[PDB]
Amino acid sequence: VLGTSARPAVMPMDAWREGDKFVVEFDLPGIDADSLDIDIERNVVTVRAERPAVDPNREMLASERPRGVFSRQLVLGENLDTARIAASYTEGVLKLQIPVAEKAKPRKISITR
Amino acid sequence: VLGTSARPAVMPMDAWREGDKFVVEFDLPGIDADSLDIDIERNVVTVRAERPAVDPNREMLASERPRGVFSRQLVLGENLDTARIAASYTEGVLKLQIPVAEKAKPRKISITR
Amino acid sequence: VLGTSARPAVMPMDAWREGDKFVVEFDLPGIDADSLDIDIERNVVTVRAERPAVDPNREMLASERPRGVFSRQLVLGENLDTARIAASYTEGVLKLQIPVAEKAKPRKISITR
Amino acid sequence: VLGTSARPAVMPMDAWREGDKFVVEFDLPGIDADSLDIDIERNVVTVRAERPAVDPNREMLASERPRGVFSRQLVLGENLDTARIAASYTEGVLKLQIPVAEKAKPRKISITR
Amino acid sequence: VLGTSARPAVMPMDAWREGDKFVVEFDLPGIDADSLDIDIERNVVTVRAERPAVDPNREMLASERPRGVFSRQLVLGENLDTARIAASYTEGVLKLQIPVAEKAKPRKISITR
Amino acid sequence: VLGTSARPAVMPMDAWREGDKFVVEFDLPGIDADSLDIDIERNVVTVRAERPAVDPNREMLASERPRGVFSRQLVLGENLDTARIAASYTEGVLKLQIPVAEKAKPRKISITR
Amino acid sequence: VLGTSARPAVMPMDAWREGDKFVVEFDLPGIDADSLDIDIERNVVTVRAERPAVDPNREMLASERPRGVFSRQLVLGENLDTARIAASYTEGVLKLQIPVAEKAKPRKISITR
Amino acid sequence: VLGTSARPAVMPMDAWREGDKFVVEFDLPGIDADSLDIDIERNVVTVRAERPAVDPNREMLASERPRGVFSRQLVLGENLDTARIAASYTEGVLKLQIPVAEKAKPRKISITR
Amino acid sequence: VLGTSARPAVMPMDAWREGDKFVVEFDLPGIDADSLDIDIERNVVTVRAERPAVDPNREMLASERPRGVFSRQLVLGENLDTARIAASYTEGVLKLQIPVAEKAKPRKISITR
Amino acid sequence: VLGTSARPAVMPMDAWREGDKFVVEFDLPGIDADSLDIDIERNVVTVRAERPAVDPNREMLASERPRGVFSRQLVLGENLDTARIAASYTEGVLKLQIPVAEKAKPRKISITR
Amino acid sequence: VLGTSARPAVMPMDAWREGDKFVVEFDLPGIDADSLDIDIERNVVTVRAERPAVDPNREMLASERPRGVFSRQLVLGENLDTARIAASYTEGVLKLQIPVAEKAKPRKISITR
Amino acid sequence: VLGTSARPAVMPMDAWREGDKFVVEFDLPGIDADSLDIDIERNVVTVRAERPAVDPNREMLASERPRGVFSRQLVLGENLDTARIAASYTEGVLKLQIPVAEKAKPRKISITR
Amino acid sequence: GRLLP
Amino acid sequence: GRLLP
Amino acid sequence: GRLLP
Amino acid sequence: GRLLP
Amino acid sequence: GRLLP
Amino acid sequence: GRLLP
Amino acid sequence: GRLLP
Amino acid sequence: GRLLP
Amino acid sequence: GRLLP
Amino acid sequence: GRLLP
Amino acid sequence: GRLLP
Amino acid sequence: GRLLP
Ligand SMILES: [Cl-]
Ligand SMILES: [Cl-]
Ligand SMILES: [Cl-]
Ligand SMILES: [Cl-]
Ligand SMILES: [Cl-]
Ligand SMILES: [Cl-]
Ligand SMILES: [Cl-]
Ligand SMILES: [Cl-]
Ligand SMILES: [Cl-]
Ligand SMILES: [Cl-]
Ligand SMILES: [Cl-]
Ligand SMILES: [Cl-]
Ligand SMILES: [Cl-]
Ligand SMILES: [Cl-]
Ligand SMILES: [Cl-]
Ligand SMILES: [Cl-]
Ligand SMILES: [Cl-]
Ligand SMILES: [Cl-]
Ligand SMILES: [Cl-]
Ligand SMILES: [Cl-]
Ligand SMILES: [Cl-]
Ligand SMILES: [Cl-]
Ligand SMILES: [Cl-]
Ligand SMILES: [Cl-]
Ligand SMILES: [Cl-]
Ligand SMILES: [Cl-]
Ligand SMILES: [Cl-]
Ligand SMILES: [Cl-]
Ligand SMILES: [Cl-]
Ligand SMILES: [Cl-]
Ligand SMILES: [Cl-]
Ligand SMILES: [Cl-]
Ligand SMILES: [Cl-]
Ligand SMILES: [Cl-]
Ligand SMILES: [Cl-]
Ligand SMILES: [Cl-]
Ligand SMILES: [Cl-]
Ligand SMILES: [Cl-]
Ligand SMILES: [Cl-]
Ligand SMILES: [Cl-]
Ligand SMILES: [Cl-]
Ligand SMILES: [Cl-]
Ligand code: NA
Ligand code: NA
Ligand code: NA
Ligand code: NA
Ligand code: NA
Ligand code: NA
Ligand code: NA
Ligand code: NA
Ligand code: NA
Ligand code: NA
Ligand code: NA
Ligand code: NA
Ligand code: NA
Ligand code: NA
Ligand code: NA
Ligand code: NA
Ligand code: NA
Ligand code: NA
Ligand code: NA
Ligand code: NA
Ligand code: NA
Ligand code: NA
Ligand code: NA
Ligand code: NA
């Protein structure tokens, strides 16, 4: 598996709401911080990472770990204060924390029967 | 994906010879060190890790990351000094380093044509 | 089939424009109205329903009907007056009616040959 | 999906014994009662429904819901009083209730070891 | 593989006519006789067995053997004297022996060419 | 494809009601009439045919046509006068004609809404 | 299955050499002779048949038999006297018999070792 | 392959950033310009084309080329000046050129380690 | 998808007879005429095209369009005047027109019944 | 399914540690004890069984049960006293019991962080 | 894998033009030269080989290598001097060398734009 | 197919016991002897071969034959005198002959019933 | 004309 | 409550 | 010895 | 009546 | 905490 | 207008 | 040049 | 009796 | 060096 | 109780 | 002649 | 550096 910009490798995600924060965690083991990039653009968060390809002159006996470009885009709802995103990378897990900023007097749709 | 002892989750592996050492690396993100266990028994190295299941009372919006028991067994050749294995865990990568201890006067099989 | 928040069961949809209204219908048989929730957030409509799991102490001879959490999200275009959504549930069909509110002087892209 | 008499669309079924009654429920959303037909013939119950095809002149933006002929046949055991079947259709669920009429002095097969 | 009443595990079957008897054999290893049930109802024989699930507190290193509810139904022809069924269980094989009771003056359909 | 008694080759079927007769046609090309057998037993019609295997000493350049035992069983409804079945074989098509004998005062199940 | 000119239905074929004749047989049950066409063009034999579609106003209970256009093309070797092809249709089998006309002094390729 | 409004045929896409322009190209061979429609609505560009079905009275010997409705929707980022889209169609390729209009003082998310 | 000489990319084809001409059309969008080559050799027409690979230094965000070598070979019947082939390329469609030159007194094979 | 020496049929296995014993159980119904062979060679246990093929002159109506050669090889760890293996066969289950003989002062690999 | 005349085993092929010769190589290991046959008939080369089946009385522990009849047919272009084919078999590779004999004044098809 | 050290191409194997010798044969056509390497290490035999990739400047018309690194490892039983392995390569078949050296007084496991 | 699929 | 699967 | 598949 | 597939 | 699948 | 599939 | 896959 | 597969 | 795939 | 999968 | 599959 | 796949 070698991810490219046009066909990125995907990384698995857990996402959950923790009270007033929305949290997303990605398994992104073995990434150098120079690679990690988090782009925010209105409601959309894009995570991009790279793991370099193995030296072509190196004979691997096993080479199962995914390499190249990783990318995933999250479309967040309007109540997420994307501007206040906090990001951390530890133990090979990229964790994003976005505050939830509920609008006042939210719509509640009733269903007719 | 929930790995059990009888059907463990598998983790990807790179393995290569680096001069006088054999190196194996596993992607094992987000493991607490209390979980990691490396058992050596003659020539066989077994790696076992656990990532706890999510609290059943927690509503996940995405839960793609593999959880439960991870396990992989490596059958190493006789020239690997398994007794002198060195193991490290950083950035979510479990790295094993086994010294290579070549026997004297190794057999070289010739092929008749 | 048991849908969860993180892996919802999906329900089939018909959608069509009827003059000045956009209509969406979902097959959602056997849902108690207490379960149905329709969330609107800017242009996105999210439909959520639940059908309870069968009593574990009940021996079913056939249990093919999907149960648990159903969810589907619709991304609507800007001309849809989502604020004026009307929703009804009858004969096991959830019907949504959204007025279409065309903007003035819409862009018409010409193609060069 | 367009079901025909020769290749009917199938509808999911739950079936269970409730004391002295056998109950079967079908998800059959959005069926006009004029369509529903339940034929009983000795021990076999056949359920037939139709959902009309969409007007060919109607441009659907999504048309995932199954249409055409639905049919399923149930072969019931001898203890089911098929003559006394009760059928109801509500919330898009077709429910059948057949009284169970156990024969006297039923056979109990013993197994030799 | 865990069979339930609504989705039973299936067991393989050999069936053959031996002169005046019809014989069916099932591979049903490791069943306690308290579990085995053979129900006959007119022409239909139903075989039901259960193999208990493994103690959840037991860590299995391999657990490939199918467990839970096994069930298979045989629809027998009219010439089978189902009332005189004989059943035995040995070496993990459930064997059924049904006498064949041919009707007098059987129909022989001729084909026109 | 070589059909056996235990795994018969199947032949395609058209079946339809023609007023007071039920008609079934099978594609069974290249069958010698000595092979064709039609067994009727209460409501069940069983069609059995054989096409001999190719002489093992014959080198075929193509041998795509199915050979061996063909068999299909039809479970007919109670209104079919199976005793009065008529069968013909022409142009490689086996045609069955069964008179329909409707019972008096048939049940018509009404559905409650 | 409905074959068209652009996507013909295919029919199974046996082909073999019988001394001085090459024989091909096709399973083509239920074809009216008005439909069958055999075109020969240099070394290529094309077989074309049609089985009419079922009357759209006829409700079939089973309609498994392939209908529409059947076609298969055979590329024959130079020794086949295609001009002297003989064709017969019986019992739903289309049989072609082409005389084999070996050229004088045929090439025999020897292989160097 | 016949695309409809509800199940459009898809056309392959290349997309890339060329300095201050974002370019998208679609393979859309054999489209009459009367068919091509490009709709822009906020950040979303929708491309719609039609290739007429073949005259039903025309016997095609091969008809592999996709026909009917083609449609693809692109969700563009906020920095794309969709209002200034330029579109051209030549050599069967639909090319879109959207100017990139970067916002001032863009957010750069830093990751904690 | 990158086609090579040994594993060419394939392009879809429509082919039909138009009175005295046989017409073949290929979807071949975005080909430079310098690439297109049509080779005729007795009855066989071979179409070869190339679409250059993307500059390796160009980061594509999507690169779905097939590139490299395209090739398809048509085996034409003897009545096709391949020497008089006419070829045109417009709107990304390669169109071939071959006159049909029927031989005198063609064979008409009769089938015995 | 007919297992051979070169492609043995496989039998399902449960394996678990029970204090000071390692236990393996195989579903091997309907095996004559003359067939069962257990070979031990250093750390490897090989289980071999045979179930005879059905008499070719016997017409089976169903023959689903696997027949022929069954074989499975277990590679046991060094702490298993293979020499003291105990084997029993009852109710169609082959049970192996191997005492666990832990070595003194076992290695415990520590992982650096 | 056991190849027969009617379903031959296939062998992989490399083919390339080397100046004035066309070369084809087949992987055909372990063939006795008595088996190899190369038939040429106008433009078509047919390669046929046989590898005998294993003695039925021999118990193989692995028998993965393909056996029986191998066959592949090549349709060569008119410029190939098939009469002057040269064939050699060494190291388990069957190599064919066919001289290329270009016709004078070859057609070059021009494409209109 | 291009085999690498980390994902070797596999070659098919026959293996059998011939009295006092164990024989393994590999289909390895077209290998230069400089490539073949047989490594023995305790009980494990590893076979490694390479077939060079085709010159990138060579246009192949077919290139189906597998190239690159081939590798297969055999785990042999204790009775195999691996030190006395004999290897030969002819007709594209690599043949290994290992003497069988049975231990004295071998264990024979009896099974309790 | 009843038949069991 | 018998039913044939 | 009839049985329904 | 726009909707995103 | 809304997110689009 | 003959063509080989 | 942002685009949503 | 030659035929092309 | 023509060959038919 | 070690075993190789 | 033992070998591990 | 030997390892069994
Ligand atoms: Cl990936
Ligand atoms: Cl919480
Ligand atoms: Cl690395
Ligand atoms: Cl896994
Ligand atoms: Cl190095
Ligand atoms: Cl966690
Ligand atoms: Cl870390
Ligand atoms: Cl679902
Ligand atoms: Cl309307
Ligand atoms: Cl319910
Ligand atoms: Cl209702
Ligand atoms: Cl359906
Ligand atoms: Cl109850
Ligand atoms: Cl409707
Ligand atoms: Cl099962
Ligand atoms: Cl007998
Ligand atoms: Cl148990
Ligand atoms: Cl069949
Ligand atoms: Cl009629
Ligand atoms: Cl025949
Ligand atoms: Cl077909
Ligand atoms: Cl003969
Ligand atoms: Cl007909
Ligand atoms: Cl006839
Ligand atoms: Cl498409
Ligand atoms: Cl650039
Ligand atoms: Cl057109
Ligand atoms: Cl392609
Ligand atoms: Cl015309
Ligand atoms: Cl381009
Ligand atoms: Cl153009
Ligand atoms: Cl098996
Ligand atoms: Cl215990
Ligand atoms: Cl037996
Ligand atoms: Cl027993
Ligand atoms: Cl093959
Ligand atoms: Cl060259
Ligand atoms: Cl051999
Ligand atoms: Cl391979
Ligand atoms: Cl021998
Ligand atoms: Cl080579
Ligand atoms: Cl050689
Ligand atoms: Na949540
Ligand atoms: Na998203
Ligand atoms: Na290495
Ligand atoms: Na290993
Ligand atoms: Na619409
Ligand atoms: Na949507
Ligand atoms: Na029940
Ligand atoms: Na039933
Ligand atoms: Na029998
Ligand atoms: Na049955
Ligand atoms: Na009918
Ligand atoms: Na039936
Ligand atoms: Na022949
Ligand atoms: Na042919
Ligand atoms: Na780009
Ligand atoms: Na998009
Ligand atoms: Na035509
Ligand atoms: Na062709
Ligand atoms: Na255990
Ligand atoms: Na093992
Ligand atoms: Na070439
Ligand atoms: Na060819
Ligand atoms: Na052997
Ligand atoms: Na092995």
PDB file of N, CA and C in Angstrom, chain H residues 70-98:
ATOM      1  N   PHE H  70     -25.149  11.448 -17.667  1.00  0.00           N
ATOM      2  CA  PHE H  70     -23.919  11.498 -16.892  1.00  0.00           C
ATOM      3  C   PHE H  70     -24.008  12.652 -15.908  1.00  0.00           C
ATOM      4  N   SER H  71     -23.483  12.456 -14.705  1.00  0.00           N
ATOM      5  CA  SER H  71     -23.541  13.518 -13.713  1.00  0.00           C
ATOM      6  C   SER H  71     -22.443  13.324 -12.694  1.00  0.00           C
ATOM      7  N   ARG H  72     -21.804  14.416 -12.298  1.00  0.00           N
ATOM      8  CA  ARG H  72     -20.872  14.317 -11.197  1.00  0.00           C
ATOM      9  C   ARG H  72     -20.921  15.650 -10.452  1.00  0.00           C
ATOM     10  N   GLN H  73     -20.851  15.622  -9.128  1.00  0.00           N
ATOM     11  CA  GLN H  73     -20.868  16.836  -8.322  1.00  0.00           C
ATOM     12  C   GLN H  73     -19.538  17.004  -7.610  1.00  0.00           C
ATOM     13  N   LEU H  74     -18.976  18.207  -7.683  1.00  0.00           N
ATOM     14  CA  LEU H  74     -17.730  18.518  -6.988  1.00  0.00           C
ATOM     15  C   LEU H  74     -18.021  19.501  -5.876  1.00  0.00           C
ATOM     16  N   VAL H  75     -17.568  19.173  -4.676  1.00  0.00           N
ATOM     17  CA  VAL H  75     -17.624  20.083  -3.538  1.00  0.00           C
ATOM     18  C   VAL H  75     -16.263  20.756  -3.434  1.00  0.00           C
ATOM     19  N   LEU H  76     -16.241  22.046  -3.741  1.00  0.00           N
ATOM     20  CA  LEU H  76     -15.030  22.841  -3.793  1.00  0.00           C
ATOM     21  C   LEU H  76     -14.809  23.571  -2.479  1.00  0.00           C
ATOM     22  N   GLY H  77     -13.548  23.878  -2.196  1.00  0.00           N
ATOM     23  CA  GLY H  77     -13.218  24.561  -0.966  1.00  0.00           C
ATOM     24  C   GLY H  77     -13.545  26.033  -1.064  1.00  0.00           C
ATOM     25  N   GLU H  78     -13.471  26.710   0.081  1.00  0.00           N
ATOM     26  CA  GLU H  78     -13.936  28.092   0.153  1.00  0.00           C
ATOM     27  C   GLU H  78     -13.059  29.034  -0.658  1.00  0.00           C
ATOM     28  N   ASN H  79     -11.784  28.696  -0.837  1.00  0.00           N
ATOM     29  CA  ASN H  79     -10.871  29.554  -1.588  1.00  0.00           C
ATOM     30  C   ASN H  79     -11.096  29.504  -3.092  1.00  0.00           C
ATOM     31  N   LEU H  80     -12.054  28.728  -3.582  1.00  0.00           N
ATOM     32  CA  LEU H  80     -12.278  28.628  -5.019  1.00  0.00           C
ATOM     33  C   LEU H  80     -13.351  29.637  -5.409  1.00  0.00           C
ATOM     34  N   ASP H  81     -12.986  30.562  -6.302  1.00  0.00           N
ATOM     35  CA  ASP H  81     -13.890  31.594  -6.811  1.00  0.00           C
ATOM     36  C   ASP H  81     -14.817  30.959  -7.848  1.00  0.00           C
ATOM     37  N   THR H  82     -15.788  30.190  -7.346  1.00  0.00           N
ATOM     38  CA  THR H  82     -16.678  29.448  -8.235  1.00  0.00           C
ATOM     39  C   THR H  82     -17.411  30.368  -9.198  1.00  0.00           C
ATOM     40  N   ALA H  83     -17.662  31.612  -8.784  1.00  0.00           N
ATOM     41  CA  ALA H  83     -18.383  32.533  -9.647  1.00  0.00           C
ATOM     42  C   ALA H  83     -17.624  32.788 -10.934  1.00  0.00           C
ATOM     43  N   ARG H  84     -16.301  32.692 -10.878  1.00  0.00           N
ATOM     44  CA  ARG H  84     -15.474  32.932 -12.053  1.00  0.00           C
ATOM     45  C   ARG H  84     -15.042  31.649 -12.752  1.00  0.00           C
ATOM     46  N   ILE H  85     -15.907  30.639 -12.761  1.00  0.00           N
ATOM     47  CA  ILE H  85     -15.558  29.391 -13.422  1.00  0.00           C
ATOM     48  C   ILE H  85     -15.532  29.603 -14.926  1.00  0.00           C
ATOM     49  N   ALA H  86     -14.560  28.979 -15.593  1.00  0.00           N
ATOM     50  CA  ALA H  86     -14.458  28.948 -17.051  1.00  0.00           C
ATOM     51  C   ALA H  86     -14.536  27.500 -17.500  1.00  0.00           C
ATOM     52  N   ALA H  87     -15.320  27.225 -18.533  1.00  0.00           N
ATOM     53  CA  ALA H  87     -15.541  25.854 -18.965  1.00  0.00           C
ATOM     54  C   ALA H  87     -15.339  25.736 -20.464  1.00  0.00           C
ATOM     55  N   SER H  88     -14.670  24.671 -20.884  1.00  0.00           N
ATOM     56  CA  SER H  88     -14.476  24.443 -22.302  1.00  0.00           C
ATOM     57  C   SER H  88     -14.619  22.962 -22.603  1.00  0.00           C
ATOM     58  N   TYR H  89     -14.988  22.667 -23.842  1.00  0.00           N
ATOM     59  CA  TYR H  89     -15.242  21.301 -24.262  1.00  0.00           C
ATOM     60  C   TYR H  89     -14.555  21.089 -25.597  1.00  0.00           C
ATOM     61  N   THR H  90     -13.529  20.254 -25.607  1.00  0.00           N
ATOM     62  CA  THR H  90     -12.836  19.998 -26.847  1.00  0.00           C
ATOM     63  C   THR H  90     -12.232  18.606 -26.816  1.00  0.00           C
ATOM     64  N   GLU H  91     -12.217  17.952 -27.973  1.00  0.00           N
ATOM     65  CA  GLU H  91     -11.662  16.609 -28.092  1.00  0.00           C
ATOM     66  C   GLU H  91     -12.330  15.640 -27.123  1.00  0.00           C
ATOM     67  N   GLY H  92     -13.601  15.886 -26.824  1.00  0.00           N
ATOM     68  CA  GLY H  92     -14.337  15.033 -25.917  1.00  0.00           C
ATOM     69  C   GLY H  92     -13.964  15.196 -24.462  1.00  0.00           C
ATOM     70  N   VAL H  93     -13.233  16.250 -24.109  1.00  0.00           N
ATOM     71  CA  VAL H  93     -12.838  16.523 -22.725  1.00  0.00           C
ATOM     72  C   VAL H  93     -13.504  17.812 -22.261  1.00  0.00           C
ATOM     73  N   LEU H  94     -14.264  17.735 -21.172  1.00  0.00           N
ATOM     74  CA  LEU H  94     -14.804  18.926 -20.528  1.00  0.00           C
ATOM     75  C   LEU H  94     -13.812  19.419 -19.478  1.00  0.00           C
ATOM     76  N   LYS H  95     -13.276  20.618 -19.685  1.00  0.00           N
ATOM     77  CA  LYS H  95     -12.285  21.218 -18.804  1.00  0.00           C
ATOM     78  C   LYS H  95     -12.880  22.391 -18.029  1.00  0.00           C
ATOM     79  N   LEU H  96     -12.745  22.366 -16.701  1.00  0.00           N
ATOM     80  CA  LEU H  96     -13.190  23.463 -15.853  1.00  0.00           C
ATOM     81  C   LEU H  96     -11.982  24.142 -15.240  1.00  0.00           C
ATOM     82  N   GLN H  97     -11.986  25.471 -15.230  1.00  0.00           N
ATOM     83  CA  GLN H  97     -10.909  26.240 -14.622  1.00  0.00           C
ATOM     84  C   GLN H  97     -11.510  27.197 -13.607  1.00  0.00           C
ATOM     85  N   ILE H  98     -11.175  27.020 -12.330  1.00  0.00           N
ATOM     86  CA  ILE H  98     -11.707  27.851 -11.255  1.00  0.00           C
ATOM     87  C   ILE H  98     -10.555  28.618 -10.621  1.00  0.00           C
TER      88      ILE H  98
END
